[PDB]
Amino acid sequence: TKYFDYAASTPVAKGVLESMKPWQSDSFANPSAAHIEAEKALNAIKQAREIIADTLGAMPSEIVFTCGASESNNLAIKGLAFKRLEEKGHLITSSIEHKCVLNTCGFLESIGFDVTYLTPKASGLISAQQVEEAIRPNTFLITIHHVNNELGTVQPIEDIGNVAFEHDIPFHTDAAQSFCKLDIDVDDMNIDMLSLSGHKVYGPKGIGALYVRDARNSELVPLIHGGGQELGLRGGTSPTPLIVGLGVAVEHFPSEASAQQTEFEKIINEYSFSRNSGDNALSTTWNVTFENDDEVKRFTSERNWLISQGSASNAMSNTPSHVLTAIGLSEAEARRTYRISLPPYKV
Amino acid sequence: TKYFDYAASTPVAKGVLESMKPWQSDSFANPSAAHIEAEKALNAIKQAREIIADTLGAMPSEIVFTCGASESNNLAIKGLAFKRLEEKGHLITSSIEHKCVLNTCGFLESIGFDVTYLTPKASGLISAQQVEEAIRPNTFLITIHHVNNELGTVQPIEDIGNVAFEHDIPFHTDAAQSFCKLDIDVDDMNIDMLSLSGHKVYGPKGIGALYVRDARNSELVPLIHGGGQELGLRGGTSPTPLIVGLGVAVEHFPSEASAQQTEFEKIINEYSFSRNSGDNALSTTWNVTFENDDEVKRFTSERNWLISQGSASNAMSNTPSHVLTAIGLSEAEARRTYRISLPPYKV
Ligand SMILES: *Cc1c(COP(=O)(O)O)cnc(C)c1O
Ligand SMILES: *Cc1c(COP(=O)(O)O)cnc(C)c1O
């Protein structure tokens, strides 16, 4: 009434909710147990894992369940770093990553790791060439997001993956905003690890995944040590309802825009604005800078939309979006800038 | 039909399921957002946090949401350890902890930390005196579980907490099996950190918590770095349905045994057995060693109960429960030993 903040979270699809229901009280075993009720949960988990693997062009065993892209990003990064506590090393990322990536890299710096935060162009774009130029003898990970959560910018992951392949450096991508929206083939894009989030694709909150190439033989240091779940890479009892719901979300991901809401497209033009990353953004995120404070006032008074201006930490520090300032907007411009996002769909 | 494996997981209460429902598709904002829908989620999260705090005699801010006791155990342990990567140090735990604790401590050993795994008595008991005798100049954490998940053994956490207090060593307890069943006051027991799991108390899977004394000023290293959630201690978008459901579970935790099922008590005596930790175990977990293989055969053919014999890793290695062998049972005895567990309730 009206919600235009889909890049922040999405509503659980009816089919997803239904599919979760039998695993609440009807059949509720710990999937680790040795009896038939655990068997049933395990089979349902297998189906979801296969659906996710299929969509990424991966093998089922290469899908590690987590609780979301934040935990996934942490596992990808710390999983490699924590095998290097003595010799340390260098990581390449961007300055416009989600704050979870920025903050995990900040922590790594605090324990002696070196990190380059690549600065975007005004378009929001990170180039493969800049990745290539940042490479050092001790670079051990390149992490670059696929689609930017504030701007919608589609990054050149294939070209970046090519650079990482040419140097035999692991390539991770935060795909929380691209998973299901954009077709992703892990081999075609030379991806080693990929993060995704359930509640960004009409799935439930509290679930996501990390693709890990050759997970069975992976030397990644587990973030959560546990009882053997997820090939020993990710501990904690498998939350069968959340896993099942995630599979259903992926399977029934909307194929057409964004329904009727994404028109929208006939409203927004009654206003004067500049779209940030306008030639490089997905159709479902419109990060827009209105022309002046008077236009902002008109827009917000006429439209009672729930939208977004930047990260929570920026709100707390009373500063503009880190993303907006990285792309070169002034503080005054940032004040007039809003992310209006629409129901995700394929394409 | 019939499920006697409650120590492994429990069925979500009707009130818990209902309470989750409006946060799936009716109101589904990211609680980090700045608008009214996030406000509503945040308020509901606050209520659950307060319910949990109240039950532990803690302050609301001292409750850190996680996805379960595994993630909580990892945060408690690695959160302290990762501030010591250079000087390392010593940790005291038991050899009969849940495998998540054993495996995180094993990892710490692999990066240069020293760990003492205290061996139980035949009763399953760990003593405060043994903790005291294991203390070293560089001991920086004592972690001992409150109630054992295989045996039901109630450990002397107050006495152990007293020892830790007398040395100004942090005391953590894995309370996944004791939370709500046994009255826990964090100040009375001198607890610094405490792990709990939602699906052990008729809550949903994928949620738990870590009590952290003085969380606001805690120097714990976050396991999941994120956008600022949980006072910066635990990243990832707050899963409002799971958090709300956990509060409801705690609030309506059963007050009387375990209903009718826990009779049970009139069945079990038709069989010949010895109860492990029989003088020290909760009424709702019966870890029992039948007299001979013939008695086992009689019991299993007559009763189609879903029960448990030991951890998943022990099943995979084709070895007896680590818990059972630690308490001194032979492999043959372990073969005849089953954990039969009942609906949890207060007292
Ligand atoms: C939402 C998001 C995250 C965090 O994912 P959660 O599942 O909410 O923890 C990370 N990266 C990007 C790009 C996102 O949009
Ligand atoms: C279940 C359990 C755990 C693990 O908790 P999850 O929430 O299932 O990850 C840890 N310790 C004990 C004692 C348990 O019973």
Q: Report the alpha-carbon angle B6-B12-B17, nearest 5.
A: 180
Report the Cα B257 to chain-centroid distance in Å. Answer: 20
Helix orientation angle between B99-110 and B69-81, rounded to the nearest 10 degrees: 20
User: Domain locations in chain A?
Assistant: 14-251, 260-341
Distances in Å between the Cα of A242 and the Cα atoms of A81, A160, A169, B32, B84 are 29, 32, 33, 21, 35
Judge if A14-251 and A260-341 fold alike in CATH terms: no
Resolution (A): 1.8
Residues near ligand 2 (Cβ within 6 A): A 236-237; B 68-70, 98, 100, 145, 149, 174, 176-177, 197, 200, 208
CA B214/CA A324 separation, integer angstroms: 35
Q: Is B113 helix (H, G, I), strand (E, B) or coil?
A: coil
- The domain A14-251 is placed in CATH, from the list 3.30.2010.10, 3.30.360.10, 3.10.20.30, 3.40.640.10, at 3.40.640.10
Least Cα distance to A184 among A126, A253, A127 occurs for: A253
Cβ of A72 less than 6 Å from ligand 1 = no
Strands A114-118 and A139-143: unpaired
CA A153/CA A145 separation, integer angstroms: 10
Q: Are B14 and A25 in contact (CB under 8 A)?
A: yes
Peptide bond connecting A266 to the previous residue in cis, omega within 30 degrees of 0: no
| Method used to obtain the model | X-ray
* Cβ partners under 8 Å of residue A336, min gap 6: A289, A290, A291, A292, A293, A295, A296
Name the helix (H) or strand (E) containing A209: strand A208-212
Q: Is A140 helix (H, G, I), strand (E, B) or coil?
A: strand
Cβ neighbours of A238 in B, within 8 Å: 205
Cβ neighbours of A307 in B, within 8 Å: 35
Interface test with A, best of B28, B195, B335 (most A CBs within 10 A): B28
Q: Are A69 and A176 in contact (CB under 8 A)?
A: yes
Cβ of A124 less than 6 Å from ligand 1 = no
Q: Which residue of B has its CA nearest to A315?
A: B34
CA B221/CA A115 separation, integer angstroms: 19
Report the Cα A285 to chain-centroid distance in Å. Answer: 14
CA A70/CA B234 separation, integer angstroms: 10
Residue range B260-341 in CATH 3.40.50.300 = no
Q: Are A129 and A105 in contact (CB under 8 A)?
A: no
Of the partner residues A103, A205, A241, the one whose CB lies closest to the CB of residue B240: A205
